[PDB]
Coordinates of N, CA, C and O in Angstrom, one line a residue:
Chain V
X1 N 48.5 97.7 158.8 CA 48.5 99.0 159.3 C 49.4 99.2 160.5 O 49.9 100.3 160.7
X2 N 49.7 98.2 161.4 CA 50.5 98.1 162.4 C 51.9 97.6 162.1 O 52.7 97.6 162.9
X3 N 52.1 97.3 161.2 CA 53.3 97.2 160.3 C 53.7 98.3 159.6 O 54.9 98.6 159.5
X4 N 52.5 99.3 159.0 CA 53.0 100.8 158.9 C 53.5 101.5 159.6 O 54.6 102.0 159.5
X5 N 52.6 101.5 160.6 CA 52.9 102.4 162.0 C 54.3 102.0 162.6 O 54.9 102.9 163.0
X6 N 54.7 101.0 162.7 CA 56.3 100.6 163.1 C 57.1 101.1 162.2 O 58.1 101.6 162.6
X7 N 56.9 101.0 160.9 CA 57.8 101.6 159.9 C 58.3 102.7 160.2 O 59.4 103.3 160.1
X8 N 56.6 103.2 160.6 CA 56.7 104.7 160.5 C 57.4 105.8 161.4 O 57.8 106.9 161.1
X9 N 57.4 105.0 162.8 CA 58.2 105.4 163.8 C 58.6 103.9 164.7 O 57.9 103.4 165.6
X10 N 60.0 103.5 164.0 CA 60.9 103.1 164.8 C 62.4 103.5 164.3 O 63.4 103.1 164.8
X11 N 62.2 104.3 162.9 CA 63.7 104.8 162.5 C 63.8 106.2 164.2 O 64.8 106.4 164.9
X12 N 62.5 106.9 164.3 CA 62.9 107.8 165.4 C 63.4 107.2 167.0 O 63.6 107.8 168.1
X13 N 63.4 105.8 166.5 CA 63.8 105.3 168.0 C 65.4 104.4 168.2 O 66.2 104.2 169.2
X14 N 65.4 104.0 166.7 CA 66.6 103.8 166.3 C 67.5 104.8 166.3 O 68.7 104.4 166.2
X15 N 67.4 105.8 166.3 CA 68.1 106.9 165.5 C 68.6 107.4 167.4 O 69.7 107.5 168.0
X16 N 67.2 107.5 168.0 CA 67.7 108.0 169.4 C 68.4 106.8 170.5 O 68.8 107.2 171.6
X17 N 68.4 105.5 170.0 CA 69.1 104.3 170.6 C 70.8 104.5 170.3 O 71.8 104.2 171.0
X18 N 70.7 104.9 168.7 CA 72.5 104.8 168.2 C 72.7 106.0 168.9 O 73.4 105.8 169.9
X19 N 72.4 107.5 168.7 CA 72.7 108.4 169.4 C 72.9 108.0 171.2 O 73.8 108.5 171.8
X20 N 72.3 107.3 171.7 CA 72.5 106.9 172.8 C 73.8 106.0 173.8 O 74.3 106.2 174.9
X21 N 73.9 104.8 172.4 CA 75.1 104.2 172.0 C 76.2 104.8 171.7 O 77.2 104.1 171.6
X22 N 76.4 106.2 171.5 CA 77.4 106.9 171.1 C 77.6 107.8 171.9 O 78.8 108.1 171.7
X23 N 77.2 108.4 172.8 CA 77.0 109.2 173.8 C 77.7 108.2 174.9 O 78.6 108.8 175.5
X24 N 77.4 107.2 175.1 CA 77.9 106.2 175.9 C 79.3 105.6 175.8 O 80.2 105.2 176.6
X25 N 79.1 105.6 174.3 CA 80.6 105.1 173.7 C 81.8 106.7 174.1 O 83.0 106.7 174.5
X26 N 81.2 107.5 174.0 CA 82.6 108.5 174.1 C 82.7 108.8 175.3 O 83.7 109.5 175.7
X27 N 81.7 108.5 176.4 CA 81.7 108.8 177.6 C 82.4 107.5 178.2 O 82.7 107.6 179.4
X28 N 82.6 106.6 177.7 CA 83.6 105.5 178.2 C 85.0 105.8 177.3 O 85.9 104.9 177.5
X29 N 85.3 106.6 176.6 CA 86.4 107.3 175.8 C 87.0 108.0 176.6 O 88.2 107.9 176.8
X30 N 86.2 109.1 177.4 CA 86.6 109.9 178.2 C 86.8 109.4 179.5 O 87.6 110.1 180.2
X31 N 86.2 107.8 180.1 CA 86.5 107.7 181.6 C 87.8 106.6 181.4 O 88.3 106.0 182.3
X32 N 88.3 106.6 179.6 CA 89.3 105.6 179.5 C 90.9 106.7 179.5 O 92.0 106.5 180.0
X33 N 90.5 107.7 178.9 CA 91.2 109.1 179.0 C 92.1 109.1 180.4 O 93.3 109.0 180.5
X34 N 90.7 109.4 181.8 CA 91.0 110.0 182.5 C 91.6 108.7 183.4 O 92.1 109.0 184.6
X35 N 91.6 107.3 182.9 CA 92.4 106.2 183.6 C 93.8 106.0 183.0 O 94.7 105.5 183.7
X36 N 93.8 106.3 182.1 CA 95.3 106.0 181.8 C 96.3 107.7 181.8 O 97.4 107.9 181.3
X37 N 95.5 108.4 182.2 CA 96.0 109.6 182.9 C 96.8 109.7 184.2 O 97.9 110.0 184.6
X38 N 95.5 109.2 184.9 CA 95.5 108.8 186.1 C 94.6 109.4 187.4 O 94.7 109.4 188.6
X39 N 93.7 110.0 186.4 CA 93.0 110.5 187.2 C 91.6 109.3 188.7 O 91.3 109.5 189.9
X40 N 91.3 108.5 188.1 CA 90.4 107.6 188.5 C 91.2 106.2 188.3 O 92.2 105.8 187.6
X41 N 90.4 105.6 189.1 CA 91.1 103.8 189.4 C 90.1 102.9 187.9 O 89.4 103.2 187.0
X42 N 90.7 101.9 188.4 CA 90.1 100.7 187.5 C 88.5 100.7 187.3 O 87.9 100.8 186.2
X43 N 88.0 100.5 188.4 CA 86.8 100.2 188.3 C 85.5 101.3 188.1 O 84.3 101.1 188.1
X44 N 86.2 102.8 187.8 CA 84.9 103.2 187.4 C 85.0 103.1 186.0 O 84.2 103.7 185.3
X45 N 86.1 102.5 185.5 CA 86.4 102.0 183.7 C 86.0 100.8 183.7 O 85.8 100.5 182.6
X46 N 85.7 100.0 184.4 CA 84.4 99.0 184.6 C 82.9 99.5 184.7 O 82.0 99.3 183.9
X47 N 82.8 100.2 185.6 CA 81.2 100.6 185.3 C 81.1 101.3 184.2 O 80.1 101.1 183.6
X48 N 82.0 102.4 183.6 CA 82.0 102.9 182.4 C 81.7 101.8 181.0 O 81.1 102.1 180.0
X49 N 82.4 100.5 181.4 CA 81.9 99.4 180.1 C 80.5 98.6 180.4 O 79.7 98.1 179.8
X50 N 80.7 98.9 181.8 CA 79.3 98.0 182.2 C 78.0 98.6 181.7 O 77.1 98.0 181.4
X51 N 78.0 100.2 181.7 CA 76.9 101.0 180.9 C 77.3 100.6 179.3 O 76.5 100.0 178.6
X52 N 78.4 101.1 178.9 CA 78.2 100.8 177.4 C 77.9 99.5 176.8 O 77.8 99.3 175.6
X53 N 77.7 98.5 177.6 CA 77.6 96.8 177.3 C 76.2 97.2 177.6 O 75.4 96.3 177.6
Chain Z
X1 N 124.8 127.5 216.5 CA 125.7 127.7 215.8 C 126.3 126.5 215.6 O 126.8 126.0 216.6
X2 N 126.5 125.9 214.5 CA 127.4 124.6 214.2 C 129.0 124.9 213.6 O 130.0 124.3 214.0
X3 N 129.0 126.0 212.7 CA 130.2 126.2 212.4 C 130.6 127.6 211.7 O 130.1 127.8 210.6
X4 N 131.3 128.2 212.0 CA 131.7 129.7 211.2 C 132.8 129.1 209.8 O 133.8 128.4 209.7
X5 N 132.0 129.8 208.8 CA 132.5 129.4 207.5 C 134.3 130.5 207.0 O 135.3 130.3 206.5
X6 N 133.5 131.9 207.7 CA 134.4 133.2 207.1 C 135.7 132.8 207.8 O 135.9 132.0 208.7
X7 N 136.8 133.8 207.1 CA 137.8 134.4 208.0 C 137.5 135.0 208.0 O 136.6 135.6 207.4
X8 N 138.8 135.2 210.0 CA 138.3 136.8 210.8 C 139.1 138.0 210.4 O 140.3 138.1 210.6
X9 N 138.6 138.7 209.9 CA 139.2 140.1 209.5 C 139.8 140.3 207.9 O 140.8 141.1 207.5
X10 N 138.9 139.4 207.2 CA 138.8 139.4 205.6 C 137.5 140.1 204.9 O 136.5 140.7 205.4
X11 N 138.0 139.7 203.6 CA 136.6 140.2 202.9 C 135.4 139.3 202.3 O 135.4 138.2 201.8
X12 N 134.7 140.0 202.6 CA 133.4 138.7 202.6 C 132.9 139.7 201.1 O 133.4 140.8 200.9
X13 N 132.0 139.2 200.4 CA 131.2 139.2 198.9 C 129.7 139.2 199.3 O 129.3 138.4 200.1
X14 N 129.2 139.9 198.8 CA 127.5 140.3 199.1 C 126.7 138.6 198.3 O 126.5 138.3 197.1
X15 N 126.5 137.9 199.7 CA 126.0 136.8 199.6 C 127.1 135.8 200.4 O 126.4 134.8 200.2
X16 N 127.5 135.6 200.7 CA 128.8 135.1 201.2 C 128.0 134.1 203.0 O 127.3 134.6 203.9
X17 N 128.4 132.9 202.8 CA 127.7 132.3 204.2 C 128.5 132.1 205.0 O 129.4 131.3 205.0
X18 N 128.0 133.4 206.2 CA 129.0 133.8 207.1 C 129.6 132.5 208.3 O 130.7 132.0 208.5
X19 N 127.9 132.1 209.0 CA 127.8 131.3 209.8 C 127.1 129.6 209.2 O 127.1 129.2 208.0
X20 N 126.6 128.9 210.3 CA 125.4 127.7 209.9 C 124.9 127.6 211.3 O 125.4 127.1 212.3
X21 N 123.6 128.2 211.1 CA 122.9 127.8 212.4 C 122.3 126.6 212.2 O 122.1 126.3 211.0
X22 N 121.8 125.8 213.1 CA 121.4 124.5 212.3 C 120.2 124.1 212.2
X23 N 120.0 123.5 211.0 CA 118.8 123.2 210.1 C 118.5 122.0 210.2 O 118.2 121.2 209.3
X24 N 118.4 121.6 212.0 CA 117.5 120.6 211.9 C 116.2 120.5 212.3 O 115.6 119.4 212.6
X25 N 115.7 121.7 212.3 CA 113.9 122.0 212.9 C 113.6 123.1 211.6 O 112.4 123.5 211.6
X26 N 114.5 123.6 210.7 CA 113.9 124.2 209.6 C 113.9 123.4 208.2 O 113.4 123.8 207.1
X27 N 114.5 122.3 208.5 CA 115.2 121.2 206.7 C 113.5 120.7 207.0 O 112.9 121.1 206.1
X28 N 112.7 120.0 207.9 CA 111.8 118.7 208.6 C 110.9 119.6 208.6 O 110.0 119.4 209.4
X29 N 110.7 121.2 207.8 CA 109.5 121.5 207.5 C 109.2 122.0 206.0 O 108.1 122.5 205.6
X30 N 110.2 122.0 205.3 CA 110.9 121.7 204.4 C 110.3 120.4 203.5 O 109.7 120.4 202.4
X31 N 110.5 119.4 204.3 CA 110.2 118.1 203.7 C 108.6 118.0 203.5 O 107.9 117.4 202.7
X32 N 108.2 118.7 204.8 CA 106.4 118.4 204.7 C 105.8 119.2 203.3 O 104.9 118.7 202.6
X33 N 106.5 120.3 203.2 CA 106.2 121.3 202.4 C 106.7 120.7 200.7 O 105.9 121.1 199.8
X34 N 107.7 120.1 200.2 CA 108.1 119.4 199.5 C 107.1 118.1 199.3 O 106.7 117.9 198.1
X35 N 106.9 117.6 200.0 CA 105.8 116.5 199.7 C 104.4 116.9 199.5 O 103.6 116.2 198.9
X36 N 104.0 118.2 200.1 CA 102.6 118.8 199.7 C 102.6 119.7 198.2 O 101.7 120.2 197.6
X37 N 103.9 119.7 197.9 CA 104.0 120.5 196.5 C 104.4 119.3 195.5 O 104.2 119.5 194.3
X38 N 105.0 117.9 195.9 CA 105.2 116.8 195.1 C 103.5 116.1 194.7 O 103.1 115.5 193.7
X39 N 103.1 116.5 195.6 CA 101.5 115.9 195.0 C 100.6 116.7 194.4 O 99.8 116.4 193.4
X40 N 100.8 118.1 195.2 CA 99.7 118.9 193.9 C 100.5 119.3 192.8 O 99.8 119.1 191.8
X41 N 101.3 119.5 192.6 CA 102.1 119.6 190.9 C 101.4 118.6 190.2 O 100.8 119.0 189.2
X42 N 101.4 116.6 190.7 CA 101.2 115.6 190.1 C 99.6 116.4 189.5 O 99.3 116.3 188.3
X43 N 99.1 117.0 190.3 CA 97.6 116.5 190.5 C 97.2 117.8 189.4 O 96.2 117.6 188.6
X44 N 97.8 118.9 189.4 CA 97.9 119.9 188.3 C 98.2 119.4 187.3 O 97.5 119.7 186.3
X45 N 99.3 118.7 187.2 CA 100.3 118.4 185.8 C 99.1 117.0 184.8 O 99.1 116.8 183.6
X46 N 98.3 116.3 185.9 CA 97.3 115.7 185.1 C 95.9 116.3 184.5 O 95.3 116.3 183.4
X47 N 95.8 116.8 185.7 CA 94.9 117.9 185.2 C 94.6 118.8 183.9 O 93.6 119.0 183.2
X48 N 96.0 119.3 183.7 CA 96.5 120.1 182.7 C 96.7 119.2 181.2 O 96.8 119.8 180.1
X49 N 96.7 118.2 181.3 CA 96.4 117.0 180.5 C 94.9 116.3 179.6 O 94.5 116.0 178.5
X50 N 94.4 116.4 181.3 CA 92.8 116.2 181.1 C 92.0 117.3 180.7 O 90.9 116.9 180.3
X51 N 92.1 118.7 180.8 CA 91.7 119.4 180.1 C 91.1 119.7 178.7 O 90.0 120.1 178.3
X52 N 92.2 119.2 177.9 CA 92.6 119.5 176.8 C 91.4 118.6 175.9 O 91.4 118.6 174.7

């Protein structure tokens, strides 16, 4: 039964972790954007990988 | 006055630079003003990039 119950809800937690992972992933897209633009230095393109890692 | 450019008692052309008073306390505000427009252009022209 507790094997059910995980079945049962952990695709809804999976589902909100890759959504999470992806949200993170394009928001390091965007702080890679605005570095080779030139808007920001190096290192908030470090904390930007350090969140997506 | 540094130097008169015209002849005297000719014809001058509508625009024509008569005299040169000199531009050394108006060129050195010039420069400040050129360097405050060399950085916000940069900072527009990225902008205008990052927008999109």
């Amino acid at each position: 039964a507790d094997g059910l119950a995980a079945r049962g809800t952990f695709t809804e937690q999976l589902q909100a972790q890759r959504d999470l992972v992806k949200a993170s992933d394009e928001y390091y897209q965007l702080a890679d954007k605005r570095y080779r633009t030139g808007v920001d230095n190096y290192l908030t393109l470090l904390d930007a990988q350090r969140s997506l890692f | 006055i540094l130097k008169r450019l015209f002849k005297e008692g000719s014809d001058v052309k509508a625009g024509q630079q008569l005299y040169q008073i000199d531009p050394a306390t108006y060129e050195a505000d010039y420069q400040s003003a050129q360097a405050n427009l060399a950085s916000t252009q940069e900072q527009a022209q990225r902008y205008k990039l990052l927008v999109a």
